[PDB]
Amino acid sequence: ESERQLRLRLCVLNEILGTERDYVGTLRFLQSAFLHRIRQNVGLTEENVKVLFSNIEDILEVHKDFLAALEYCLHPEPQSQHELGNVFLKFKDKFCVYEEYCSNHEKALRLLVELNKIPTVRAFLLSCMLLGGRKTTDIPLEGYLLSPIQRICKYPLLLKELAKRTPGKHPDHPAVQSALQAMKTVCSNINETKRQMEKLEALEQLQSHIEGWEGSNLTDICTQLLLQGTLLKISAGNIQERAFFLFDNLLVYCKRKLYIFRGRINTEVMEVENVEDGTADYHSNGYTVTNGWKIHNTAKNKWFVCMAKTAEEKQKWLDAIIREREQRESLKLGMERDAYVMIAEKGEKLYHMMMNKKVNLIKDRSTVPKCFLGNEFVAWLLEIGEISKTEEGVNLGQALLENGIIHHVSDKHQFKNEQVMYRFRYDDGTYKARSELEDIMSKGVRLYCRLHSLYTPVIKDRDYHLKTYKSVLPGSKLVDWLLAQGDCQTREEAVALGVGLCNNGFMHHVLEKSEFRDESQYFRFHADEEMEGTSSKNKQLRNDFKLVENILAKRLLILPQEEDYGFDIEEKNKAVVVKSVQRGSLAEVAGLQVGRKIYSINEDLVFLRPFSEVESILNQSFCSRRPLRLLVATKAKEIIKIPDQPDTLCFQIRGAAPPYVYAVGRGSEAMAAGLCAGQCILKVNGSNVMNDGAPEVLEHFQAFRSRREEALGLYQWIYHTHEDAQEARASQEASTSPMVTLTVDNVHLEHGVVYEYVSTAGVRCHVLEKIVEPRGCFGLTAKILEAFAANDSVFVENCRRLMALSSAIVTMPHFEFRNICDTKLESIGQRIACYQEFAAQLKSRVSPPFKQAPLEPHPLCGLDFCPTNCHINLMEVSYPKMSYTQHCITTMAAPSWGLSFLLKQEDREIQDAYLQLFTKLDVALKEMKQYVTQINRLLSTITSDKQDKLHGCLEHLFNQVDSINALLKGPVMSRAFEETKHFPMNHSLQEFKQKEECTIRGRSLIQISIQEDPWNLPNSIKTLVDNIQRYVEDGKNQLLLALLKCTDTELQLRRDAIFCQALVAAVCTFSEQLLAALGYRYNNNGEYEESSRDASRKWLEQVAATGVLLHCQSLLSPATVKEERTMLEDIWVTLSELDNVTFSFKQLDENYVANTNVFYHIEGSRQALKVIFYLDSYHFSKLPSRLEGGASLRLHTALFTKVLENVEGLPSPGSQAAEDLQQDINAQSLEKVQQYYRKLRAFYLERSNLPTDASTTAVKIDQLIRPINALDELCRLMKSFVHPKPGAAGSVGAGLIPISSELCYRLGACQMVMCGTGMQRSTLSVSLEQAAILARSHGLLPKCIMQATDIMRKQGPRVEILAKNLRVKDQMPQGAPRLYRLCQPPVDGDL
């Protein structure tokens, strides 16, 4: 190895020289810049210069002499004959100059920290570096003060390295070893170098324990180790047990036999991604991960996966990784920030010192506007005294160019001293504040709403010059109130808000003449002006939000065919109507009828448009193959006339009271007569049948009288639900002119009001609010009931099997426990029979198409699982600045029979723990079965590289086994064994705890197999795994038996009902919101001009990444109404349980079911329930790839609850507890929204980093700051609503509702609204939320916000909930804030 040692010594000699050149370079530029440039112009004092830099000077001379003395030996270049030792030995005494420096260094750092707290001094100190020629963003002065103390400590290491290479024959050898004793003793006598030496000693020590090392030494690229340990490197090829060392810029991994090098990664070219427990992969080499994360070398494009034994070690590793990332990134962003701002502060100062006539350099000179010459600027910098050397000036002028303060006029040149023409980026207007102007709408709406939500209002009637003004706010009281709520820190900021509100037409002074001031002047929102009727007469009170037309409509869905959708349109009586429906078309199958008026085409209100433009909308939808969504005029009762054929029917009927159309044949005379599925038959040839069976209806028809059940006729049948289409298909698989007049009731009708308004863009807009009966509700309630019956069939079947393994009854406590268990199994049996019946009831019911609030209490029935008064409030909007959006807010009565009082919440939390523990233990054994298969696969492919891979796999198997032992050992299983203590089993609690001795023996036998006979390894694995499977099943069995015993079957029946009502409403809400989004119609972000396609795609990808948030305006009066309190105490516990629900999606076509994009299905136990939203090919293909691949979408819930009236009088001790319970609900909901907001923020940070043109990332970041600044405001507000500070309490009113509405709207939640009836309080919140959505997102002119809010609560489609529930007593809120009351009509006349 002679040539190696030869070239290696030359490399040490080069490293000494090369690193000293740049280090003395460092000392030279710092001396030049700091001392001389600080004295030219001035805040730093003479003594402060002395303390900072002067001990550099005394070092610097010794180091220049040392550099010369080294460069003299190493002439003309470093050569193998050279000596240096004597040059150290002579300098050894000269290096004792460090004794003063080190004694002062602590004082110099301690000065620098304080001088960096003073903005001017920090900027002056960075300026020194900038003019010198050093990029400020690359090295800190904070580092430079240490850099001398580092390099004296390096000299011992430098000698040690030269000594590693040089042979004993070389004459420098004895000098170098003497010089090592010297440079060591030098650094050892001084505390500061001793510290730097011991911290380097650790790095060299570790490197000395590592063999095989590649790349640069640890001392030279890292300051400290951060973390050390063994992990499983899962990698391409196969798994590798390894040691991992993390150091401050470098991760290095080694084979563990002291250690042997394998490879290293710079923490810059690293990237990290987390993976969830139970995840497995394709396009990555792994298996069922738990306790892992993924690493990406961005330089080599290499993924690999770490795994740790425990979660605690996963967390220790990801936390150290995150910290190292944040420390490096925070220095870099802190230096870039600090540096940019001083360049700005100087740039602006010097700009406004150049714009005065004392200087005037910025002149016009093709003609070039507002320019200057670089020579003159540098000269002027020397003349004013800002520089000492012209070189500094070209450094500053190039820095102001590269930082964007200036540029060249011709698009050619950098900055030069050279009479070249330049210009400041001020001149073309590159700076502005307009982000404070777009947010003034949102702030305005949020403000108006909070003020009018006050129970003791601050906007009110007040007299001026002894004459009443009606709805006025003193400008100074507005300021006092903006401040008291924390919206603005200063009165000045509140005045700036006030001025911009007045400019954007929110409010005015009581005379035209004044701006907003902090004076006693009176101010009034135009939204009151329009409602109290207080315009001057010559403006006619133009109602710029008005009603257009009330609609009653059936929603159809049509998939495109070979030439069209299956129909034509015509203009008739100045309306668009259905001209002709093609026989046997998918439109006929939807139930489109000839002569019907059409209210919307893909949510565009086509009745408002010219006929030639509507044909173009149909065509554009068809050309883009969109699934068509109509609204068509349909009456609540209808007359249909059927040809009575002699041989066969063409339709099916069933249902008792009322009878209903179960099915109809495609292309039939019945279908062409307009018979359609779900129609509930009232009369036949005049004869009433509304309480008469399907046979009585069928008996009118000649074919039925002839053939009875055989009367069906070999048509392709179409059906009322997918449930009916399934039971028909299954029935098929198990087997392989005279007239009649029907008067029918059309179920599933949407009642709508088209509002018109003029937008803030000055253009006309329409809103289609609809109250919709959720078509799926009865079918979905049956499917959830079926799923609970299926789960309970699996539960009863397991627990009966276990009681059949316990053959003996040895003691009376065994008999008592068995009798309890037998009874509870029979009870769950009775529950299974009930839910199958109730599902058959619900499948056998079609009217009323929503649960009315029950007129009377009664014993339990199938409708008690459907949500009471469940209706979806759609709100479609037509083009602002052609845009379409479709907000969804479901309304229901709060679900009803509370649970939070009935449950010892401990029982629920134990039952969660048991059902999750059982689900986990079952998954962990399911992986363990696949693991033994993957090892047998590897062994077949094999029959030291193979040994490393195999050892990694076998270790990972034992890790999985530990990922079971930690579940079986736990306190949850121990408590289960204490509950099941009467039941006979093969193991006691003491046994399994002691059976870690069985896994220690098994591991030792596997290791013995690896050492003595590698072909006995499968037998050893099988033995270990079979023993563990017996323990896992014995755990599963104990947990189902503990569950059977601790389940209260009566409460569970209730819970299921509340859950079923809630989940149905939730799933219906999300169904509608999902179908809006998958239709390119959801948009929480219409404020920011955003195209609804993009907003929808962003929400879909967001929901895939984050979960669905369901937000409930709980809107119950628990302090006052005992019924509503029981509904609150139920829904709170229930939404906590709905958090465990996972949505998921699958493609499934029909063309055998009318009008249903979605067919739900349900899988999984109560805990971890899964809803499969079966979607059509079109909507499924608009899912994100995460959800298309079958992955689970998690539901998060929040529930915000404020009384819409005041509480009058002092609360009783019970009412105080109701308010406290209300406050707890709001607290838990605030934490859960904040988490969803954090997970959205994190998701947006990742999204902004996605590999794209850097200009688009910068624009995205500037965009995303506005939503986030508004959201952070809404969070501050929510915290002050939910946790009011001492003495601010009561001052906030019901504002929690419009504000938590705004929050969960902004986040993109599915929105739900509830009250004891679902038919009055709910109208007041939905009407406000919709009016606020219009005002904050679609630019409804702010003067109209209350007008829409009251018109909606008077004339909107919601009054139809009262005209469908006339028998239900409800109370319009008398104690409500002016935002929630109806406004009385104006008293002064002139309407």
Residue numbers in the entry: 42 to 83, 90 to 304, 324 to 431, 436 to 806, 839 to 983, 1015 to 1030, 1063 to 1108, 1212 to 1659
Sentences from the paper on this structure:
Despite ongoing limitations imposed by preferred orientation, we obtained a final P-Rex1 single-particle reconstruction at a nominal resolution estimated by Fourier shell correlation (FSC) to 3.8 Å. However, due to anisotropy effects, we estimate the true resolution to approximately 4.5 Å consistent with map features. Clear secondary structure features are present in the maps, allowing us to accurately dock our closed 3.2 Å DH-PH-DEP1 crystal structure and the 3.2 Å DEP2-PDZ1/2-IP4P15 structure into the reconstruction (T4L was omitted). An AlphaFold21 model of the previously unsolved four-helix bundle (4HB) IP4P region allowed us to build a complete model of autoinhibited P-Rex1. The autoinhibited DH-PH-DEP1 domains form the N-terminal half that makes extensive contacts against the surface of the C-terminal DEP2-PDZ1/2-IP4P half. Intriguingly, the P-Rex1 PI(3,4,5)P3 and Gβγ membrane-binding prenylation sites are off-axis by around 90° in the autoinhibited structure. As such, we hypothesize that the cooperative binding of Gβγ and PI(3,4,5)P3 to P-Rex1 at the plasma membrane results in the counter-rotation of the N- and C-terminal P-Rex1 halves to align the membrane-binding regions along a single plane.
P-Rex1 and its close homolog P-Rex2 are highly conserved GEFs that activate Rho GTPases (Rac1, Cdc42, RhoG) to coordinate cytoskeletal organization and cell motility. P-Rex1 is a 186 kDa multidomain-containing protein with an N-terminal catalytic DH domain, a PI(3,4,5)P3-binding PH domain, tandem Dishevelled, Egl-10 and Pleckstrin domain (DEP) domains, tandem PDZ domains and a phosphoinositide-4-phosphatase domain (IP4P). P-Rex guanine nucleotide exchange factors are autoinhibited, synergistically activated by Gβγ and PI(3,4,5)P3 binding and dysregulated in cancer. P-Rex family members are autoinhibited under basal conditions and are thought to be synergistically activated at the plasma membrane by receptor tyrosine kinases (RTKs) and G protein-coupled receptors (GPCRs).
